[PDB]
Structures are given as C-alpha cells and as structure tokens.
Short mmCIF file of C-alpha atoms in Angstrom, two decimals:
data_model
loop_
_atom_site.label_atom_id
_atom_site.label_comp_id
_atom_site.label_asym_id
_atom_site.label_seq_id
_atom_site.Cartn_x
_atom_site.Cartn_y
_atom_site.Cartn_z
CA UNK V 216 -24.61 14.04 29.35
CA UNK V 217 -22.37 15.01 32.31
CA UNK V 218 -20.01 12.39 33.67
CA UNK V 219 -17.98 12.30 36.90
CA UNK V 220 -14.46 13.64 36.95
CA UNK V 221 -11.63 11.82 35.11
CA UNK V 222 -7.92 11.92 35.96
CA UNK V 223 -4.81 12.44 33.79
CA UNK V 224 -1.28 11.02 33.48
CA UNK V 225 1.75 12.88 32.17
CA UNK V 226 4.81 10.56 31.97
CA UNK V 227 6.88 12.40 34.59
CA UNK V 228 10.09 10.70 33.43
CA UNK V 229 11.98 7.61 32.27
CA UNK V 230 15.18 6.54 33.97
CA UNK V 231 17.68 5.40 31.33
CA UNK V 232 16.29 7.34 28.43
CA UNK V 233 16.85 10.76 26.82
CA UNK V 234 13.89 12.20 24.83
CA UNK V 235 12.57 8.62 24.52
CA UNK V 236 15.61 7.42 22.58
CA UNK V 237 18.07 4.59 23.23
CA UNK V 238 19.95 1.81 21.41
CA UNK V 239 20.24 -1.97 21.72
CA UNK V 240 23.15 -4.09 20.52
CA UNK V 241 20.94 -6.70 18.79
CA UNK V 242 20.87 -9.42 21.41
CA UNK V 243 21.40 -7.69 24.74
CA UNK V 244 18.36 -7.16 27.00
CA UNK V 245 18.01 -4.16 29.29
CA UNK V 246 15.41 -2.70 31.67
CA UNK V 247 14.53 0.68 33.04
CA UNK V 248 11.98 2.59 35.12
CA UNK V 249 8.92 4.61 33.99
CA UNK V 250 7.78 7.32 36.40
CA UNK V 251 4.16 8.45 36.03
CA UNK V 252 2.04 10.70 38.28
CA UNK V 253 -1.69 11.05 38.81
CA UNK V 254 -2.31 14.78 38.28
CA UNK V 255 -5.90 14.64 39.60
CA UNK V 256 -6.56 15.80 43.19
CA UNK V 257 -9.70 13.77 43.91
CA UNK V 258 -10.05 10.75 41.62
CA UNK V 259 -8.03 7.51 41.94
CA UNK V 260 -7.70 5.08 39.08
CA UNK V 261 -8.38 1.41 39.84
CA UNK V 262 -7.37 -0.03 36.46
CA UNK V 263 -4.17 0.10 34.43
CA UNK V 264 -3.34 -2.07 31.40
CA UNK V 265 -0.15 -1.96 29.40
CA UNK V 266 -0.02 -3.09 25.75
CA UNK V 267 3.39 -2.94 23.99
CA UNK V 268 3.18 -2.00 20.34
CA UNK V 269 5.84 -1.77 17.66
CA UNK V 270 6.82 -0.41 14.25
CA UNK V 271 6.72 -3.76 12.45
CA UNK V 272 3.24 -4.48 13.88
CA UNK V 273 2.11 -1.11 12.50
CA UNK V 274 3.78 -1.32 9.07
CA UNK V 275 2.31 -4.54 7.66
CA UNK V 276 -0.54 -4.73 5.19
CA UNK V 277 -3.40 -6.43 7.08
CA UNK V 278 -3.61 -8.93 4.23
CA UNK V 279 -0.15 -10.43 3.73
CA UNK V 280 -0.58 -14.22 3.33
CA UNK V 281 -2.03 -14.30 -0.22
CA UNK V 282 1.19 -14.94 -2.21
CA UNK V 283 3.35 -16.75 0.36
CA UNK V 284 4.19 -20.46 0.83
CA UNK V 285 3.73 -22.04 4.25
CA UNK V 286 7.41 -22.43 4.96
CA UNK V 287 8.20 -18.70 4.49
CA UNK V 288 4.90 -17.81 6.19
CA UNK V 289 5.70 -19.70 9.38
CA UNK V 290 9.08 -18.06 10.12
CA UNK V 291 7.79 -14.50 9.71
CA UNK V 292 4.64 -15.21 11.57
CA UNK V 293 6.47 -16.86 14.48
CA UNK V 294 8.95 -13.98 14.79
CA UNK V 295 6.07 -11.53 14.61
CA UNK V 296 4.22 -13.31 17.38
CA UNK V 297 7.37 -13.44 19.54
CA UNK V 298 8.16 -9.75 18.93
CA UNK V 299 4.58 -8.87 19.81
CA UNK V 300 4.20 -10.86 23.04
CA UNK V 301 7.81 -10.84 24.48
CA UNK V 302 9.91 -7.98 23.03
CA UNK V 303 8.75 -5.62 25.79
CA UNK V 304 7.65 -7.06 29.09
CA UNK V 305 6.09 -5.49 32.18
CA UNK V 306 7.03 -6.46 35.74
CA UNK V 307 5.31 -5.46 39.03
CA UNK V 308 3.16 -2.78 37.51
CA UNK V 309 0.89 -0.91 40.02
CA UNK V 310 -2.88 -1.56 40.48
CA UNK V 311 -4.05 1.65 42.21
CA UNK V 312 -2.58 5.17 42.31
CA UNK V 313 -3.93 7.73 44.74
CA UNK V 314 -4.48 11.42 43.70
CA UNK V 315 -1.29 13.40 43.41
CA UNK V 316 0.87 10.28 43.67
CA UNK V 317 3.92 9.40 41.59
CA UNK V 318 4.77 5.77 40.90
CA UNK V 319 7.78 4.10 39.23
CA UNK V 320 7.29 0.78 37.43
CA UNK V 321 9.92 -1.37 35.71
CA UNK V 322 9.92 -2.29 32.00
CA UNK V 323 12.17 -4.89 30.43
CA UNK V 324 13.11 -4.35 26.76
CA UNK V 325 14.69 -7.47 25.28
CA UNK V 326 15.38 -8.18 21.60
CA UNK V 327 17.12 -11.51 21.08
CA UNK V 328 15.02 -12.07 17.93
CA UNK V 329 13.89 -9.03 15.95
CA UNK V 330 14.37 -8.14 12.29
CA UNK V 331 16.55 -5.25 11.03
CA UNK V 332 13.67 -2.84 10.67
CA UNK V 333 12.54 -2.67 14.34
CA UNK V 334 13.23 1.11 14.55
CA UNK V 335 10.35 2.36 16.59
CA UNK V 336 8.37 1.39 19.67
CA UNK V 337 4.97 2.87 20.63
CA UNK V 338 3.96 1.65 24.06
CA UNK V 339 0.41 2.84 24.66
CA UNK V 340 -1.35 2.46 28.00
CA UNK V 341 -4.98 2.50 29.07
CA UNK V 342 -6.00 3.49 32.61
CA UNK V 343 -9.54 3.25 33.98
CA UNK V 344 -11.27 5.04 36.82
CA UNK V 345 -13.89 2.82 38.40
CA UNK V 346 -17.52 3.97 38.20
CA UNK V 347 -19.81 3.96 41.24
CA UNK V 348 -19.73 0.18 41.49
CA UNK V 349 -22.74 -0.12 39.17
CA UNK V 350 -21.96 -1.28 35.64
CA UNK V 351 -18.74 -0.20 34.00
CA UNK V 352 -15.35 1.59 34.11
CA UNK V 353 -14.37 4.79 32.39
CA UNK V 354 -11.28 4.18 30.24
CA UNK V 355 -8.68 6.50 28.66
CA UNK V 356 -5.71 6.45 26.29
CA UNK V 357 -2.08 7.58 26.37
CA UNK V 358 0.36 6.77 23.53
CA UNK V 359 3.94 7.84 24.49
CA UNK V 360 6.39 6.76 21.72
CA UNK V 361 9.96 5.47 21.80
CA UNK V 362 12.66 5.65 19.05
CA UNK V 363 14.76 2.57 19.84
CA UNK V 364 17.74 2.05 17.48
CA UNK V 365 19.36 -1.25 16.55
CA UNK V 366 23.02 -1.72 15.84
CA UNK V 367 24.57 -4.60 13.85
CA UNK V 368 26.46 -7.30 15.69
CA UNK V 369 27.68 -10.85 15.11
CA UNK V 370 25.79 -12.34 12.15
CA UNK V 371 26.01 -15.66 10.32
CA UNK V 372 25.52 -15.25 6.51
CA UNK V 373 26.17 -18.82 5.29
CA UNK V 374 27.14 -22.36 6.16
CA UNK V 375 27.69 -25.87 4.71
CA UNK V 376 27.54 -29.46 5.98
CA UNK V 377 30.51 -31.48 4.61
CA UNK V 378 29.83 -34.88 6.25
CA UNK V 379 32.71 -36.73 7.92
CA UNK V 380 34.09 -39.79 6.13
CA UNK V 381 36.67 -41.37 8.47
CA UNK V 382 37.88 -41.24 12.07
CA UNK V 383 40.96 -39.29 13.10
CA UNK H 77 52.82 -24.71 -13.94
CA UNK H 78 53.67 -24.09 -10.24
CA UNK H 79 53.30 -20.32 -10.64
CA UNK H 80 49.92 -19.41 -12.11
CA UNK H 81 48.90 -16.38 -14.10
CA UNK H 82 45.52 -14.76 -14.48
CA UNK H 83 43.70 -14.53 -17.82
CA UNK H 84 42.54 -11.19 -19.23
CA UNK H 85 44.82 -9.46 -16.65
CA UNK H 86 48.40 -9.20 -15.38
CA UNK H 87 48.20 -10.60 -11.84
CA UNK H 88 50.26 -13.61 -10.80
CA UNK H 89 49.82 -16.06 -7.93
CA UNK H 90 52.21 -18.43 -6.18
CA UNK H 91 51.98 -20.25 -2.89
CA UNK H 92 55.20 -19.74 -0.92
CA UNK H 93 55.20 -23.31 0.51
CA UNK H 94 53.82 -25.11 -2.52
CA UNK H 95 54.45 -28.64 -1.24
CA UNK H 96 53.28 -29.26 2.31
CA UNK H 97 52.75 -32.58 4.15
CA UNK H 98 50.89 -32.70 7.47
CA UNK H 99 48.79 -35.07 9.59
CA UNK H 100 45.00 -35.52 9.50
CA UNK H 101 42.98 -32.86 11.28
CA UNK H 102 45.82 -30.48 12.17
CA UNK H 103 45.11 -27.03 10.83
CA UNK H 104 47.86 -25.65 8.56
CA UNK H 105 48.60 -22.31 6.88
CA UNK H 106 49.62 -21.22 3.38
CA UNK H 107 50.84 -17.92 1.95
CA UNK H 108 49.28 -17.05 -1.44
CA UNK H 109 51.86 -14.49 -2.56
CA UNK H 110 50.37 -12.13 -5.17
CA UNK H 111 51.97 -9.93 -7.89
CA UNK H 112 49.78 -7.13 -9.21
CA UNK H 113 51.12 -4.61 -11.73
CA UNK H 114 48.34 -4.14 -14.29
CA UNK H 115 46.86 -0.61 -13.96
CA UNK H 116 44.81 -0.23 -10.79
CA UNK H 117 43.89 -1.94 -7.50
CA UNK H 118 41.68 -5.04 -7.18
CA UNK H 119 39.26 -6.48 -4.66
CA UNK H 120 39.55 -10.18 -5.47
CA UNK H 121 37.97 -12.71 -3.11
CA UNK H 122 39.25 -16.26 -2.47
CA UNK H 123 37.00 -19.12 -1.35
CA UNK H 124 36.81 -22.90 -1.20
CA UNK H 125 33.62 -24.67 -2.38
CA UNK H 126 32.76 -27.97 -0.66
CA UNK H 127 30.11 -28.97 -3.22
CA UNK H 128 30.20 -32.00 -5.46
CA UNK H 129 30.64 -30.84 -9.01
CA UNK H 130 28.29 -32.25 -11.66
CA UNK H 131 29.68 -35.07 -13.77
CA UNK H 132 29.13 -34.69 -17.58
CA UNK H 133 30.85 -42.41 -20.45
CA UNK H 134 31.04 -45.88 -18.95
CA UNK H 135 30.43 -46.27 -15.24
CA UNK H 136 34.03 -47.40 -14.76
CA UNK H 137 35.06 -43.82 -15.72
CA UNK H 138 32.03 -41.93 -14.30
CA UNK H 139 32.61 -43.15 -10.78
CA UNK H 140 36.35 -42.55 -11.11
CA UNK H 141 35.53 -38.91 -11.93
CA UNK H 142 33.02 -38.66 -9.12
CA UNK H 143 35.46 -40.09 -6.59
CA UNK H 144 37.96 -37.41 -7.67
CA UNK H 145 35.29 -34.70 -7.33
CA UNK H 146 34.04 -35.95 -3.92
CA UNK H 147 37.55 -36.14 -2.48
CA UNK H 148 38.24 -32.62 -3.75
CA UNK H 149 34.92 -31.38 -2.32
CA UNK H 150 35.07 -32.86 1.23
CA UNK H 151 38.76 -33.60 1.75
CA UNK H 152 40.20 -30.20 2.77
CA UNK H 153 38.29 -27.23 4.08
CA UNK H 154 39.13 -23.53 4.57
CA UNK H 155 38.84 -21.75 7.92
CA UNK H 156 38.77 -18.28 6.22
CA UNK H 157 35.95 -18.61 3.63
CA UNK H 158 34.92 -15.44 1.83
CA UNK H 159 38.14 -13.76 2.86
CA UNK H 160 37.88 -10.43 1.02
CA UNK H 161 41.50 -9.52 0.22
CA UNK H 162 41.42 -5.90 1.38
CA UNK H 163 43.34 -3.90 -1.22
CA UNK H 164 46.21 -4.55 -3.64
CA UNK H 165 47.51 -1.17 -4.91
CA UNK H 166 49.16 -1.16 -8.34
CA UNK H 167 52.73 -2.28 -8.68
CA UNK H 168 52.62 -3.97 -5.25
CA UNK H 169 52.18 -7.46 -3.73
CA UNK H 170 50.10 -9.10 -1.02
CA UNK H 171 50.19 -12.11 1.28
CA UNK H 172 46.74 -13.63 1.39
CA UNK H 173 47.42 -15.85 4.36
CA UNK H 174 45.04 -18.82 4.23
CA UNK H 175 44.22 -21.46 6.86
CA UNK H 176 43.06 -25.02 6.22
CA UNK H 177 42.09 -28.27 7.88
CA UNK H 178 42.02 -31.74 6.30
CA UNK H 179 39.64 -34.59 7.21
CA UNK H 180 40.39 -37.28 4.61
CA UNK H 181 43.83 -38.87 4.31
CA UNK H 182 45.38 -38.74 0.87
CA UNK H 183 47.40 -36.73 -1.66
CA UNK H 184 45.75 -33.60 -3.07
CA UNK H 185 48.07 -32.94 -5.93
CA UNK H 186 47.17 -29.64 -7.72
CA UNK H 187 44.11 -29.25 -5.46
CA UNK H 188 41.08 -27.84 -7.16
CA UNK H 189 38.14 -26.09 -5.54
CA UNK H 190 40.24 -23.31 -4.13
CA UNK H 191 39.37 -20.70 -6.75
CA UNK H 192 39.63 -16.93 -6.55
CA UNK H 193 37.29 -14.57 -8.39
CA UNK H 194 37.85 -10.94 -9.11
CA UNK H 195 35.19 -8.31 -8.50
CA UNK H 196 36.04 -6.30 -11.56
CA UNK H 197 35.25 -8.67 -14.44
CA UNK H 198 34.08 -11.87 -12.71
CA UNK H 199 37.11 -14.07 -13.42
CA UNK H 200 37.25 -17.67 -12.10
CA UNK H 201 40.99 -18.25 -12.24
CA UNK H 202 41.97 -21.63 -10.71
CA UNK H 203 44.63 -20.40 -8.31
CA UNK H 204 44.64 -23.73 -6.52
CA UNK H 205 46.93 -25.40 -9.08
CA UNK H 206 50.02 -24.24 -7.19
CA UNK H 207 49.40 -26.38 -4.09
CA UNK H 208 50.30 -30.03 -3.41
CA UNK H 209 48.89 -30.74 0.01
CA UNK H 210 49.49 -34.26 1.48
CA UNK H 211 47.40 -35.17 4.57
CA UNK H 212 48.02 -38.58 6.12
CA UNK Q 230 21.84 22.73 31.71
CA UNK Q 231 22.66 19.00 31.93
CA UNK Q 232 21.20 18.61 28.40
CA UNK Q 233 23.35 20.37 25.79
CA UNK Q 234 22.47 21.24 22.20
CA UNK Q 235 24.53 22.17 19.14
CA UNK Q 236 24.58 25.50 17.35
CA UNK Q 237 23.50 25.73 13.70
CA UNK Q 238 22.20 22.12 13.86
CA UNK Q 239 19.85 19.89 15.82
CA UNK Q 240 22.21 17.24 17.24
CA UNK Q 241 21.90 16.76 20.99
CA UNK Q 242 24.28 15.39 23.63
CA UNK Q 243 23.91 13.89 27.06
CA UNK Q 244 25.80 11.61 29.39
CA UNK Q 245 23.89 8.59 30.70
CA UNK Q 246 25.42 9.22 34.18
CA UNK Q 247 26.18 12.94 34.49
CA UNK Q 248 27.05 12.48 38.20
CA UNK Q 249 29.66 9.94 39.12
CA UNK Q 250 32.06 9.46 42.10
CA UNK Q 251 35.08 7.20 41.92
CA UNK Q 252 38.35 6.74 43.81
CA UNK Q 253 41.33 8.47 42.25
CA UNK Q 254 43.37 6.47 39.82
CA UNK Q 255 40.67 3.96 38.85
CA UNK Q 256 39.85 4.10 35.16
CA UNK Q 257 36.10 4.69 34.70
CA UNK Q 258 33.74 5.34 31.77
CA UNK Q 259 30.94 7.70 30.93
CA UNK Q 260 28.54 6.84 28.08
CA UNK Q 261 28.00 9.91 25.87
CA UNK Q 262 24.68 9.55 23.99
CA UNK Q 263 24.62 11.59 20.75
CA UNK Q 264 21.09 12.02 19.34
CA UNK Q 265 21.19 12.96 15.63
CA UNK Q 266 17.94 14.02 14.02
CA UNK Q 267 18.72 16.95 11.71
CA UNK Q 268 19.47 15.86 8.10
CA UNK Q 269 22.58 13.76 7.54
CA UNK Q 270 25.24 11.64 9.22
CA UNK Q 271 28.04 13.30 11.22
CA UNK Q 272 31.74 12.58 11.57
CA UNK Q 273 32.20 14.44 14.81
CA UNK Q 274 35.46 13.72 16.76
CA UNK Q 275 35.97 13.79 20.51
CA UNK Q 276 39.19 15.04 22.10
CA UNK Q 277 40.52 16.30 25.39
CA UNK Q 278 43.31 18.91 25.51
CA UNK Q 279 45.62 18.69 28.56
CA UNK Q 280 46.99 22.17 27.83
CA UNK Q 281 47.01 25.04 30.24
CA UNK Q 282 44.79 27.63 28.51
CA UNK Q 283 46.63 30.97 28.40
CA UNK Q 284 45.35 33.55 30.91
CA UNK Q 285 44.06 36.82 29.38
CA UNK Q 286 43.12 41.95 36.69
CA UNK Q 287 44.83 41.67 40.11
CA UNK Q 288 46.97 38.72 41.09
CA UNK Q 289 44.25 37.37 43.41
CA UNK Q 290 41.95 36.82 40.38
CA UNK Q 291 44.81 35.98 38.03
CA UNK Q 292 46.22 33.07 40.02
CA UNK Q 293 42.73 31.76 40.88
CA UNK Q 294 42.05 31.65 37.11
CA UNK Q 295 45.42 30.06 36.26
CA UNK Q 296 44.92 27.40 38.94
CA UNK Q 297 41.47 26.70 37.40
CA UNK Q 298 42.93 26.05 33.97
CA UNK Q 299 45.83 24.03 35.36
CA UNK Q 300 43.52 21.81 37.33
CA UNK Q 301 41.27 21.38 34.24
CA UNK Q 302 44.23 20.64 31.95
CA UNK Q 303 46.12 18.07 34.06
CA UNK Q 304 43.49 16.65 36.33
CA UNK Q 305 41.81 14.02 34.08
CA UNK Q 306 42.90 12.21 30.94
CA UNK Q 307 40.90 10.36 28.27
CA UNK Q 308 42.30 6.97 27.28
CA UNK Q 309 40.53 7.13 23.88
CA UNK Q 310 41.63 10.62 22.72
CA UNK Q 311 41.07 11.73 19.12
CA UNK Q 312 38.28 9.13 18.81
CA UNK Q 313 36.62 8.95 15.43
CA UNK Q 314 32.92 8.40 16.11
CA UNK Q 315 32.32 5.97 13.18
CA UNK Q 316 28.92 7.00 11.78
CA UNK Q 317 25.69 8.35 13.26
CA UNK Q 318 23.02 8.23 10.52
CA UNK Q 319 20.15 10.73 10.61
CA UNK Q 320 17.35 10.19 13.14
CA UNK Q 321 19.47 7.79 15.20
CA UNK Q 322 21.58 7.72 18.34
CA UNK Q 323 25.16 6.63 19.11
CA UNK Q 324 26.91 5.72 22.33
CA UNK Q 325 30.35 7.33 22.31
CA UNK Q 326 31.56 5.15 25.18
CA UNK Q 327 34.53 7.05 26.67
CA UNK Q 328 37.14 5.90 29.12
CA UNK Q 329 38.88 8.28 31.53
CA UNK Q 330 41.18 8.31 34.51
CA UNK Q 331 41.94 11.01 37.06
CA UNK Q 332 45.28 11.84 38.62
CA UNK Q 333 44.42 14.88 40.79
CA UNK Q 334 41.61 14.57 43.33
CA UNK Q 335 38.81 17.13 43.25
CA UNK Q 336 35.42 18.20 41.97
CA UNK Q 337 35.45 18.76 38.18
CA UNK Q 338 31.99 20.22 38.04
CA UNK Q 339 31.07 21.04 34.43
CA UNK Q 340 34.44 19.78 33.33
CA UNK Q 341 35.98 21.69 30.43
CA UNK Q 342 38.68 20.54 28.05
CA UNK Q 343 36.45 17.72 26.77
CA UNK Q 344 34.87 19.26 23.68
CA UNK Q 345 33.66 17.20 20.74
CA UNK Q 346 34.09 19.05 17.40
CA UNK Q 347 31.97 18.47 14.37
CA UNK Q 348 34.06 17.64 11.30
CA UNK Q 349 31.33 18.93 8.94
CA UNK Q 350 31.33 22.71 9.65
CA UNK Q 351 34.24 23.11 12.08
CA UNK Q 352 32.10 23.70 15.17
CA UNK Q 353 33.52 23.58 18.70
CA UNK Q 354 30.42 22.43 20.60
CA UNK Q 355 31.45 22.13 24.26
CA UNK Q 356 29.87 18.82 25.38
CA UNK Q 357 31.87 18.85 28.64
CA UNK Q 358 29.20 20.82 30.48
CA UNK Q 359 27.12 17.62 30.88
CA UNK Q 360 29.60 15.93 33.22
CA UNK Q 361 30.19 16.58 36.93
CA UNK Q 362 32.99 14.18 37.86
CA UNK Q 363 34.18 13.87 41.49
CA UNK Q 364 37.42 11.96 42.04
CA UNK Q 365 38.44 11.38 45.64
#
C-alpha cells in the first residue's frame, strides 16, 4: 500500500518556557504561546485537535473504586474530572496551516485545584491531513512533554466551629 | 499555685499578667514567661481546645459539671492555635506571647483548656492554671 | 549563549527576560530560573560584587579595560545581595526573583559581577552572561 504524502510538526518553540519546565505557585494561573511550523512543502493539514493529559491521569490504577466509600470517592473523582477538563485550556487554536507556515497559539495553564503530586504534564496533539474528499482523514501523533513544578503556598490544616452563645 | 511547674522535667511557667479583666469580644494578649534549665532545648507546643470534655452522679451535679466544661470550651478562644514555640536553649527563658478573644461574659478563674504539650515525652501539663481572665 | 550551564554538574540557568530596557533609577526585576536535574538539592547563593577588579599593555588598552571594570562594578546594584536560595530539590526548578537598580546609564551587555556560586563544591559559575540590561 502506498499512501499520499503526510506532513510533520516540530514544536518550533514555547514562549515562557525553558526546556519545557516552569513552576506555578499553587493557585495562580498563567498562559503562554506555543509556536509550531508545518515542515512539509506541499501538504496542508485541515485538522488539529488538542488533548491535555497529566501525570495523575497517567498514574492511577484503572480499577480504583473497589475499596472506597462514596464520600471519599466523590471528592477524588470530582477533582480528577476538574483537573482533566480544565487544568489546561486552549484558546483560539488554528484550523488550517499552509505548507512551510509557522503559527503561534495560546495555552492557558491554571491550577486552582490540583493535588500535591501534579508534577508532570504531557500535552499530546493529533493533526490530520484531509484525504481526497472521499472517506476519511489521515491522522498523526505528537507527544511533547512538560515538567511543571508546584510550590507550597497558603494552606488551611484544621478548623473548629465554636457556636456563638450571646450577643456582644 | 500561681506559678506552675512541669512534671518529669525542670521547666516552669508563669503568666506575667496573671489577673486580667477586659470587655467582651476585645482581643487581649498574655505573656507566658518560661524558665528552662533542665539539660537541653525543647520544642513544646501550646494550644487551646474548644471541645466539650466527656463527663464521667445525680443530674444536679452532672449538669453543673457540664456547664463548667461548656463554658471552658466555648468561652475564650486563641488566635494563635498550634503556635510552635520555636526554640528554648538550655539555661534560658522565652516569652510565648499569646492572643485571645472572649465571647461569653463571666469569670474564668484558673482557666483550663489552655494546655501545652512537649514534643520530647508527650507531657500534658496544665499551664492554664496561672491565668484568671475576667470578661464582662 | 543566552542559555548557560554549570561545570561538573547538570544544573542550568536562564533569565525569563534576558533583554530588558528601563529608565535609569527605577528598580526592576529579572526572574532567574534555575533548572536542577542532576542528583541532589543545591544551596547556591547569588551575589554581586561592586568592586573594581584589579587590572593585570599600552595605556590605550589599559584605561579601556579599567573603565570596563569600573562601569561593571558601580553601574548596577542588587537589592537582595547575598541571597540564600532556599532549596531546589532534584529534578525541579526555582525562580530566584532578583531586584536591581542602575545608577549609571549604559548598555551592560553580558553583565559581569553577578555570579551565583554553588555552596556544595565551591564553584564560581558565571550566570551573568544571560542578561543584557540597557538602562537609559
């Protein structure tokens, strides 16, 4: 089997990163630019899809709700869902890139709610060159990593209630 | 009685202003002066527990005891809970400056609850016996 | 050249904004990112020496060279000198946020003087090469 040509991406640069490393302050959100170029000289991709993907989503046993009550299940599962669907967000990504074109797209990394083992971030993309308008699209993979560090900040370790008893 | 000593150790505690009268809700400060001369430094931690202690008696005495415990528990509260006293080198003193606020008028003679535990042998010395707060 | 490495180790240094222009006399800041990945935490300390480095040649070269060291020594100051970078555990990054201020307008391309030294093997890694300050 002999296909048509397929293009390639290279991750030309990232704006506020150095060797794909950076820190948060455990609550502050930031954003930066990802610069990617289409190395091919003829083909043009008509599909891009970004899936953020993270260390905690990697490092869980796929069966983890056997020995767990609902109350403790709910909090972990809620924070897992939030971290999956909102920890890294994509804004104004491109739809088409011509051959030998470089494009910058913005990426917003926010962690207002992540546990203290989110040390790792493995954004993988998939870009697709359209076929000859017949059946399908030819997809591809690219799995650039990130080593994001998390620093401690203001934390509440306890409380009480002490109900009031009389006006002042 | 006003100056308290620690069991199985040498350290001594005294509040500088043992008797203090203030108004309801106004935060006030104490100075828990410390004498330490035993052998070596300590890392004792002072905290106030606002939890109703368990009663062990006729009801006329049980509810008396519970009223005492409840007033102790939710009368006065500490603005510096879990205040790790940093270091007390041997043959030296320290001023563990505490801060409070009261919410129930009354007389807390020899106030309990304010207890300090040492992270060397897990003491539970009742250092609060040297205070006579009166909040109106 | 903007990225600078360390000898006999794997720690790496870079300024988030290697190029910056600012009016003279306004205190500014440059975030020094310190990527540690080798084996163990560091206790490296940053410092800036405002000392005219002794000269080692005709007068035309000699005074050029002396003026270069003088400008380097007493052009810029660091408001957080002798900073103790607290801890940078292995395979992690730190932001040694520095604060400066200039007192002599010019172009301090690859500014010297600023050299962080590792307090683990007594290195003198010159991290100043990653900065290209221009004070008007």
